[PDB]
Short mmCIF file of C-alpha atoms in Angstrom, two decimals:
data_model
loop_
_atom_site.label_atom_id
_atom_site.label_comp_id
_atom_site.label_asym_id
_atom_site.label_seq_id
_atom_site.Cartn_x
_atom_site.Cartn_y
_atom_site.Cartn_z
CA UNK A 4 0.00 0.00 0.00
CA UNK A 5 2.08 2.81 -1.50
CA UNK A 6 -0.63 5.24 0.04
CA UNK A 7 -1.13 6.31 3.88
CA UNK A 8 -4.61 5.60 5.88
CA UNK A 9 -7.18 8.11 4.00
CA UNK A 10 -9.21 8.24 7.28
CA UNK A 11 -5.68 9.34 9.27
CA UNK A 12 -4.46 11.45 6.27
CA UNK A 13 -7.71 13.63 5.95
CA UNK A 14 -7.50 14.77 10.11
CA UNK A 15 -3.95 15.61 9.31
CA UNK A 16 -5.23 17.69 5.96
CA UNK A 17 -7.70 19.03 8.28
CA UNK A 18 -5.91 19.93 11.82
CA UNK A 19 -2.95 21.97 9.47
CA UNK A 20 -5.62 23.92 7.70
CA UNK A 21 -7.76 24.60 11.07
CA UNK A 22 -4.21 25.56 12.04
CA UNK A 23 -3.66 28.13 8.90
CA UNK A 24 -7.08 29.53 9.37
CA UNK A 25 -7.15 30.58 13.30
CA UNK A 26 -3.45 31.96 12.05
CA UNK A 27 -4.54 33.53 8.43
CA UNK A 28 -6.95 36.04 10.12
CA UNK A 29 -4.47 36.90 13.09
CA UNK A 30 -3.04 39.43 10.07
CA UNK A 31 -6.54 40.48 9.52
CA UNK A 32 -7.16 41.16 13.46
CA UNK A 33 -3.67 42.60 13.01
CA UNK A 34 -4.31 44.55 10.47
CA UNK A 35 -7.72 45.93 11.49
CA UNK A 36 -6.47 46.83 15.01
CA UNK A 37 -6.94 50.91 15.60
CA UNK A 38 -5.98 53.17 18.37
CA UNK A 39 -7.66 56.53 18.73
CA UNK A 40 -7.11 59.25 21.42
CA UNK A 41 -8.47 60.15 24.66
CA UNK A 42 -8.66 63.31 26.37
CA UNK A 43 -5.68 64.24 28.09
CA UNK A 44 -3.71 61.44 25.71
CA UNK A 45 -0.98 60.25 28.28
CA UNK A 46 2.81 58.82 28.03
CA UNK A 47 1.37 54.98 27.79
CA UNK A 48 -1.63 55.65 25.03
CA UNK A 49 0.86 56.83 22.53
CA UNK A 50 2.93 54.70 23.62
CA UNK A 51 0.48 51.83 22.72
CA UNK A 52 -0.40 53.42 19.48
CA UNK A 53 3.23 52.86 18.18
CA UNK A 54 3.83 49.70 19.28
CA UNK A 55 0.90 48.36 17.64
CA UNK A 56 2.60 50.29 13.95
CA UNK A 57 5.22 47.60 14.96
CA UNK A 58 3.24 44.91 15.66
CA UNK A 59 1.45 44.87 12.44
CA UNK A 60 4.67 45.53 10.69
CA UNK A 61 6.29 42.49 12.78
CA UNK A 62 3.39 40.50 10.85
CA UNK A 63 3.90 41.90 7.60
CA UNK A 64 6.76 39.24 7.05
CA UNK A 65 4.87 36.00 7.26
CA UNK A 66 1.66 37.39 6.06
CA UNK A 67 3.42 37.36 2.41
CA UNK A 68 4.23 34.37 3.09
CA UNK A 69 0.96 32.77 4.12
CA UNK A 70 -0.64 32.42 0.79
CA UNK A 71 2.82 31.62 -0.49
CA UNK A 72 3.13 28.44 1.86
CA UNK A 73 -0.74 27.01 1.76
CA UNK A 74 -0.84 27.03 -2.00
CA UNK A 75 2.51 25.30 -1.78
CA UNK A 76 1.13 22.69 0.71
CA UNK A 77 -2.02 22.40 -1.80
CA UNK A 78 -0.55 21.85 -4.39
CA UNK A 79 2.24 18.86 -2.56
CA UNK A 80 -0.55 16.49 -2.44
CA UNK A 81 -2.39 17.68 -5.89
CA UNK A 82 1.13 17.20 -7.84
CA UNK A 83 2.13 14.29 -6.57
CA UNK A 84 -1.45 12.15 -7.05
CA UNK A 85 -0.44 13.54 -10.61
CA UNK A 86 3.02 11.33 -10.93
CA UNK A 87 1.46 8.86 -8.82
CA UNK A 88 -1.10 8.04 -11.34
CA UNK A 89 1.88 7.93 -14.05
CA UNK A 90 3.57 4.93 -12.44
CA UNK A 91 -0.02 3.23 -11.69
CA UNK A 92 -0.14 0.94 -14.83
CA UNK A 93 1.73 -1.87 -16.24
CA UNK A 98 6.28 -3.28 -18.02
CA UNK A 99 10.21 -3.90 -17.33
CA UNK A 100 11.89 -3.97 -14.05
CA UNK A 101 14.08 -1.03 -15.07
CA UNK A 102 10.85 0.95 -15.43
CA UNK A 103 9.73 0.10 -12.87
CA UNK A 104 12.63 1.18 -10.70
CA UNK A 105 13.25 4.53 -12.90
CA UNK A 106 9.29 5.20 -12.39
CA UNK A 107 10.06 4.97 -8.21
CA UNK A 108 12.87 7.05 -7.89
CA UNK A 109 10.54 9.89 -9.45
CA UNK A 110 8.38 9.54 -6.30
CA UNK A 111 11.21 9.23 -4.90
CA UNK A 112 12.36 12.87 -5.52
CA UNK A 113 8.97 13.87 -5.76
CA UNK A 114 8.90 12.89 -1.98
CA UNK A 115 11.79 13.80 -1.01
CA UNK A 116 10.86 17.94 -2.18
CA UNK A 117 7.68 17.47 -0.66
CA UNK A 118 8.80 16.86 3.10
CA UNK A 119 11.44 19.35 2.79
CA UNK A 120 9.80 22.39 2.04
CA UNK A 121 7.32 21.09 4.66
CA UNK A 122 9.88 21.07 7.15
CA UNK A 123 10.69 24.47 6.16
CA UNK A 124 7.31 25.87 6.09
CA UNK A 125 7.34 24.74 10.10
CA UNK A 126 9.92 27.19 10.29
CA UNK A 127 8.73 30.15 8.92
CA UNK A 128 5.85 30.07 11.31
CA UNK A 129 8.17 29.46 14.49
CA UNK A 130 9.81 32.40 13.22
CA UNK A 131 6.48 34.66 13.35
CA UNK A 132 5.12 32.89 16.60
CA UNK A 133 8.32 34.77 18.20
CA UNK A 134 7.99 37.73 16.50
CA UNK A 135 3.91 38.33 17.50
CA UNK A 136 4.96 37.17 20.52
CA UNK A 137 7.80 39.51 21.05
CA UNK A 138 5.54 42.97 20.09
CA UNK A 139 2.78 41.49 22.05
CA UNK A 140 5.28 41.40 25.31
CA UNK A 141 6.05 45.41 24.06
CA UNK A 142 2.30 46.14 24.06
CA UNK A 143 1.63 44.04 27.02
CA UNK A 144 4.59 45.78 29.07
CA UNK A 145 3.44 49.42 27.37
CA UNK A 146 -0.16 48.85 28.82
CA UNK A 147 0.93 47.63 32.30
CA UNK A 148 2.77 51.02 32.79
CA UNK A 149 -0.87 53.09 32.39
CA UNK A 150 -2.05 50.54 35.11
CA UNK A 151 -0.28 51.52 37.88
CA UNK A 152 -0.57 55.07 37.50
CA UNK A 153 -4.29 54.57 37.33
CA UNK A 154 -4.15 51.69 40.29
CA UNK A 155 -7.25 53.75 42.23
CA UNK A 156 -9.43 52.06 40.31
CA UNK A 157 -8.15 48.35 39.54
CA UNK A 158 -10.95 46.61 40.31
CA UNK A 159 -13.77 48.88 38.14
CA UNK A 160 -10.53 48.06 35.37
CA UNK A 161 -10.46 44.29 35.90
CA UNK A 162 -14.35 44.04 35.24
CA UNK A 163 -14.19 46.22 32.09
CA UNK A 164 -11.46 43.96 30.85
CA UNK A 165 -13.15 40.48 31.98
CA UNK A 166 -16.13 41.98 30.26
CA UNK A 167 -14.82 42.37 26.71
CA UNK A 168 -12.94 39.32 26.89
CA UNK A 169 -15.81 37.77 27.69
CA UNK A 170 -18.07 39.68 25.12
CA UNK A 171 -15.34 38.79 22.43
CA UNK A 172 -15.85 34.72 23.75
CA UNK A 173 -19.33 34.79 23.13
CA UNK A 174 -18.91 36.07 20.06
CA UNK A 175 -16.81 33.16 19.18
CA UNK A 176 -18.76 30.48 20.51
CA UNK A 177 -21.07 31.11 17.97
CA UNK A 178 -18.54 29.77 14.97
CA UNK A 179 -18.21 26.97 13.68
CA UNK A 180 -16.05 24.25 13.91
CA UNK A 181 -13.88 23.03 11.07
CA UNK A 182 -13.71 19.17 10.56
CA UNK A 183 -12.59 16.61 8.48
CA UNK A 184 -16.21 14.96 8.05
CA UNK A 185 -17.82 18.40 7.07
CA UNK A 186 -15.40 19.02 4.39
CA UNK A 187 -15.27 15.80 2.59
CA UNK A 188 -19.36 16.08 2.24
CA UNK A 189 -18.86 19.08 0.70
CA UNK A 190 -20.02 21.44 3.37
CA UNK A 191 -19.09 24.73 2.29
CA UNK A 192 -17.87 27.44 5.01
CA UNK A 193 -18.54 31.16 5.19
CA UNK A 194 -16.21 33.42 6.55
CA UNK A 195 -17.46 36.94 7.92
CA UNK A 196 -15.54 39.47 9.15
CA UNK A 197 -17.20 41.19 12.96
CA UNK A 198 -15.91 44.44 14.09
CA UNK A 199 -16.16 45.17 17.44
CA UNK A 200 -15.82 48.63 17.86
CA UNK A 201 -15.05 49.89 21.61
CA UNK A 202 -15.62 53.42 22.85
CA UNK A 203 -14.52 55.89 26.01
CA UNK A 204 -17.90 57.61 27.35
CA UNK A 205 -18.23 60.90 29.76
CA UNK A 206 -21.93 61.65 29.96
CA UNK A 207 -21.63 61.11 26.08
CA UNK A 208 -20.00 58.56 23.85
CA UNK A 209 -16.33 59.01 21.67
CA UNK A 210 -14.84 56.04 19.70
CA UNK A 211 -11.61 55.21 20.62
CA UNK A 212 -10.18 51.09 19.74
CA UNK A 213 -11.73 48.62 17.17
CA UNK A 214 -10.47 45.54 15.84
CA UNK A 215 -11.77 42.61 13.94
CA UNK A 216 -12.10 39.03 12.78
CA UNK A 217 -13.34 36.50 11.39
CA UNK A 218 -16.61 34.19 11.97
CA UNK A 219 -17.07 30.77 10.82
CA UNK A 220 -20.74 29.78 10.06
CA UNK A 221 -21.76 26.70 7.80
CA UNK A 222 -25.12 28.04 6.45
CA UNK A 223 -26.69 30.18 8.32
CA UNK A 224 -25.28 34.27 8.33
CA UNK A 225 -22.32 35.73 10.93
CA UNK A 226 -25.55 38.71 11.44
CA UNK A 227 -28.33 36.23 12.46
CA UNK A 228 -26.04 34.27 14.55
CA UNK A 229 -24.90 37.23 16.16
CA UNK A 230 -27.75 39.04 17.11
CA UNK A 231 -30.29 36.51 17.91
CA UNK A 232 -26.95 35.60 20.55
CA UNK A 233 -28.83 36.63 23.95
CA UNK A 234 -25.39 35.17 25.74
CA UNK A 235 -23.77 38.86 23.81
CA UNK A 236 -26.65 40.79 24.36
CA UNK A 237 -25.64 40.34 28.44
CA UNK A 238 -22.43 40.97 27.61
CA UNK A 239 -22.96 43.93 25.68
CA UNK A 240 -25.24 45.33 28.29
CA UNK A 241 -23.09 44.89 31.49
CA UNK A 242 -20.24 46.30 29.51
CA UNK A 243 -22.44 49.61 29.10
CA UNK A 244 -22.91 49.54 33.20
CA UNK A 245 -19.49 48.73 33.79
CA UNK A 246 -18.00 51.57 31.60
CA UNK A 247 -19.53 54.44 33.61
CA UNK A 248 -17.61 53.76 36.85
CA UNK A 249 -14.63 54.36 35.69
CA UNK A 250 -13.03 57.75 34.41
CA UNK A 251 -11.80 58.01 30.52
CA UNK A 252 -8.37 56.95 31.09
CA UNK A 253 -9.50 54.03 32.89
CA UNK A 254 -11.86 53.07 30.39
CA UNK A 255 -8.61 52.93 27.71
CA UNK A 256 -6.76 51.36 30.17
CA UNK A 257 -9.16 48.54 30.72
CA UNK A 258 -10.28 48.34 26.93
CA UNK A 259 -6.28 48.05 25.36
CA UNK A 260 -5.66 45.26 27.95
CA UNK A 261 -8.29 43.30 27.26
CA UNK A 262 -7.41 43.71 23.24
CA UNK A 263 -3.58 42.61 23.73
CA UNK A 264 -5.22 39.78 26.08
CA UNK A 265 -7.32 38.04 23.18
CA UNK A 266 -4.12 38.72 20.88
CA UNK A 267 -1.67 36.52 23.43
CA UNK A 268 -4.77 33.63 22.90
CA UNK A 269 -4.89 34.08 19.44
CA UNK A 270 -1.64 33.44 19.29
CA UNK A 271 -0.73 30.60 20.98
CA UNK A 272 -2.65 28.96 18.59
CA UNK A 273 0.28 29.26 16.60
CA UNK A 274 1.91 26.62 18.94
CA UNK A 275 -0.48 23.74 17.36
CA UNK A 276 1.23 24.08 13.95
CA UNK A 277 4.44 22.47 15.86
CA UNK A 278 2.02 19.56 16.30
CA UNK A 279 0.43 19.38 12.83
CA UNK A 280 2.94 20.69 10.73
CA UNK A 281 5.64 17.81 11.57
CA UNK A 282 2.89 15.43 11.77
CA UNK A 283 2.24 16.37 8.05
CA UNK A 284 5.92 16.13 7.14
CA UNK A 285 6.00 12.59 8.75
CA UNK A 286 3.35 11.79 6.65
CA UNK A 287 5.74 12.02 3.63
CA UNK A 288 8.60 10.44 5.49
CA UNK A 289 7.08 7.11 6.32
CA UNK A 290 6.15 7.27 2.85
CA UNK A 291 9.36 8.00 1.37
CA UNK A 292 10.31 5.09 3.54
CA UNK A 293 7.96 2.54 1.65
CA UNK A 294 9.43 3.87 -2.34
CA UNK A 295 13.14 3.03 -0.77
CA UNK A 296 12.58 -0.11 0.37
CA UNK A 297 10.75 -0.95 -3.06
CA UNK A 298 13.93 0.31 -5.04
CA UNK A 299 16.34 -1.54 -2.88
CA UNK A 300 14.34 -4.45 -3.24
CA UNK A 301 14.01 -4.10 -7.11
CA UNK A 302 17.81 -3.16 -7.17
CA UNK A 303 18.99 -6.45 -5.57
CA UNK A 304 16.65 -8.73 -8.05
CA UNK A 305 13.58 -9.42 -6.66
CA UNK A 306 10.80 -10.64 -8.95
CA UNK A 307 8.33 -7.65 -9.26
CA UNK A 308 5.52 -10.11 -8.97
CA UNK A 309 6.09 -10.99 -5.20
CA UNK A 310 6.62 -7.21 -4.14
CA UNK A 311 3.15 -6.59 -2.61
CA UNK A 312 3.00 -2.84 -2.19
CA UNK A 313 3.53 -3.20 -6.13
CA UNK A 314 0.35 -5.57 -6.96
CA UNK A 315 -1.69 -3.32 -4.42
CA UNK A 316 -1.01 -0.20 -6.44
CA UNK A 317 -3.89 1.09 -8.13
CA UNK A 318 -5.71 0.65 -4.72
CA UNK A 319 -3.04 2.81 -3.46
CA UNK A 320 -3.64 5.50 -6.52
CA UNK A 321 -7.17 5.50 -5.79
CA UNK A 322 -6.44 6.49 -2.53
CA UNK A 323 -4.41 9.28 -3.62
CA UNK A 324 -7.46 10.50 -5.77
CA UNK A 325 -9.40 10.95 -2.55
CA UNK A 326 -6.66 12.94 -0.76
CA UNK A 327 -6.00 14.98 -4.26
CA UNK A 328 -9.79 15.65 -3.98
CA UNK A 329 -10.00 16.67 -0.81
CA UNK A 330 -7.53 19.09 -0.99
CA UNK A 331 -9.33 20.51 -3.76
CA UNK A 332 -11.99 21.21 -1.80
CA UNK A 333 -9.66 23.06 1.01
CA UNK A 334 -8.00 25.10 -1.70
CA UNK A 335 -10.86 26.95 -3.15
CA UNK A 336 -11.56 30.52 -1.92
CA UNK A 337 -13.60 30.81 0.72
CA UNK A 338 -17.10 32.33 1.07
CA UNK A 339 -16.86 36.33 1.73
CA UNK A 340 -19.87 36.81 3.84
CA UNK A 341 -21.56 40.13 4.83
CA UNK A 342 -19.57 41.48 7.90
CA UNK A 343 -20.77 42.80 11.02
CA UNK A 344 -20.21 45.57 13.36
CA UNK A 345 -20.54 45.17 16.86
CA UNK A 346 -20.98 48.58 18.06
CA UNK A 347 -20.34 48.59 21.93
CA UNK A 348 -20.93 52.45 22.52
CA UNK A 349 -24.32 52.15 20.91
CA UNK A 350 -25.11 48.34 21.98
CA UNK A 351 -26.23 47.73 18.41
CA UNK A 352 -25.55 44.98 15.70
CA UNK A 353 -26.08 46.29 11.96
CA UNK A 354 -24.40 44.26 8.82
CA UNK A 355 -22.81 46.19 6.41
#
C-alpha cells in the first residue's frame, strides 16, 4: 500500500488547515487593530499606538508568506497524485525502478519544504509574541498610575474578553467529516468597535475578525446571541464607573489579552505541521525499500505494495480531492459591526 490511511491522512489535511485559518486572520485582526485618542492622551496611550505600527509591521513578514506556503502545501498532495497516477499501470523492471525514484524525488521535495514551512511560522510565533510582550509591558505602565481604580478596570477587561468569547462560541467548527461532504464554510468578518464615554460617547479602539458559520449568516447568529446581548449590556454599566483613562486602560488590555490567545494557537502548527511532514517520510520510507528491493533482483511479482497499487492510486485521488476542496476561496460573507458604545448589531 504505497498510500497512507485516507481516514488518518484527511485529520492531518484538516488539523494543518484549522491551524492556517485561526493563524490567516491573526493578520486580519492585526491589520484591522486601531488606536484613537483620549482626552488628556498620556505617556502609555501613545505609547500603545506605536507599538501596535510595529506589531502589524512584525506581521507583515509571514503574512506574504501565508498564501505563499498554503498554495505550496495544496498543491504537494495535488502534484504528486499527478506522478502517482503515471507509475499506476503496467512493463520492465528497469521501469519500474526509474518510475520509483521519481516519487522518490517527488517525496523527497515534498517533506522538505514542509519542514521548512514549520519554520517560517516558528519564526512569526516569536515575533507576534515579542511585540505582544512590548504592548503588554506598554499597557501595564498606564495601570499603575491609574491603580485607584483596579478593580472597576479588571471588570471592564473580563467583560470584553468575555463579550469577544461569546462572540466566538457562535462559529463553527472546522472538521474533516464536514469538508469531505462538501459542506461549504462562510467566513465573515465582525468588528467590534469599543468606545470611552463621559456623559456622552467618543470612539476610541476597534479591531476585527473573522466568523465561521456553515449556512446560516455571521448577522443572524450574532444578534439573535442573547449570551452577547448580556455581555454587551453589562459592559455599558461597567464603563460608567470608571473615568476616561480608565476606560482605555481597561479596553487596550483586554485587546492585547485576546491577541496573546490568538496566538498561541500558533503553537499547534508544531504539532500538525511535523505530523504532516511525517506523513511524507514514512512514505518516502515505503518507495526506498521498493527500489532496494528491485535493485537487488527481486521478482516484481512478489513485491506486494507493487500488486496493491492502483488501490493505493485511488487512494491518492481521494486525498488529491480533498484538498481541492480546502484550496478553493472561501465564502466572503456580509460582515458585522458590533458597536459597543451604541449596543447595536447592523451588517454592512
Amino acid at each position: 500500500m504505497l498510500s497512507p490511511n485516507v481516514d488518518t491522512a484527511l485529520n492531518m489535511l484538516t488539523d494543518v488547515y484549522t491551524d492556517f485559518l485561526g493563524i490567516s486572520n491573526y493578520d486580519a485582526t492585526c491589520n484591522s487593530l486601531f488606536i484613537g485618542h483620549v482626552a488628556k492622551d498620556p505617556n502609555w496611550l501613545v505609547e500603545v499606538r506605536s507599538r501596535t505600527e510595529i506589531l502589524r509591521a512584525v506581521m507583515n513578514e509571514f503574512m506574504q508568506q501565508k498564501p505563499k506556503i498554503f498554495a505550496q502545501i495544496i498543491t504537494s498532495f495535488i502534484n504528486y497524485q499527478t506522478t502517482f497516477d503515471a507509475c499506476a499501470q503496467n512493463t520492465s523492471t528497469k521501469q519500474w525502478i526509474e518510475c520509483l525514484q521519481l516519487l522518490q524525488k517527488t517525496l523527497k521535495q515534498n517533506i522538505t519544504l514542509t519542514n521548512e514551512a514549520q519554520q517560517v511560522f516558528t519564526k512569526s510565533y516569536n515575533q507576534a509574541k515579542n511585540a505582544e510582550e512590548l504592548l503588554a509591558s506598554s499597557i501595564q505602565d498606564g495601570w499603575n498610575e491609574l491603580a485607584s481604580e483596579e478593580q472597576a478596570m479588571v471588570r471592564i477587561a473580563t467583560e470584553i474578553g468575555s463579550l469577544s468569547q461569546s462572540i466566538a462560541s457562535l462559529g463553527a467548527n472546522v472538521t474533516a467529516a464536514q469538508l469531505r461532504a462538501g459542506k461549504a464554510y462562510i467566513q465573515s468578518m465582525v468588528t467590534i468597535s469599543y468606545g470611552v464615554v463621559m456623559t456622552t460617547s467618543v470612539p476610541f479602539l476597534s479591531f476585527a475578525g473573522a466568523l465561521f458559520t456553515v449556512g446560516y449568516s455571521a448577522y443572524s447568529t450574532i444578534s439573535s446571541a442573547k449570551e452577547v446581548q448580556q455581555d454587551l449590556d453589562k459592559l455599558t454599566q461597567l464603563q460608567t464607573l470608571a473615568s476616561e483613562e480608565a476606560q482605555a486602560a481597561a479596553i487596550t488590555k483586554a485587546i492585547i489579552q485576546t491577541l496573546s490567545n490568538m496566538s498561541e494557537e500558533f503553537l499547534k502548527i508544531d504539532d500538525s505541521l511535523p505530523a504532516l511532514s511525517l506523513l511524507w517520510q514514512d512514505e518516502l520510507d515505503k518507495v526506498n525499500e521498493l527500489i532496494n528491493a528491485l535493485q537487488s533482483g527481486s521478482d516484481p511479482a512478489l513485491l506486494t505494495d507493487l500488486q496493491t497499487i492502483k488501490i493505493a492510486s485511488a487512494s491518492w485521488k481521494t486525498i488529491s480531492e480533498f484538498v481541492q476542496l480546502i484550496s478553493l476561496p472561501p465564502n466572503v460573507g456580509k460582515p458585522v459591526l458590533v458597536n459597543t458604545l451604541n449596543n447595536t448589531i447592523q451588517e454592512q
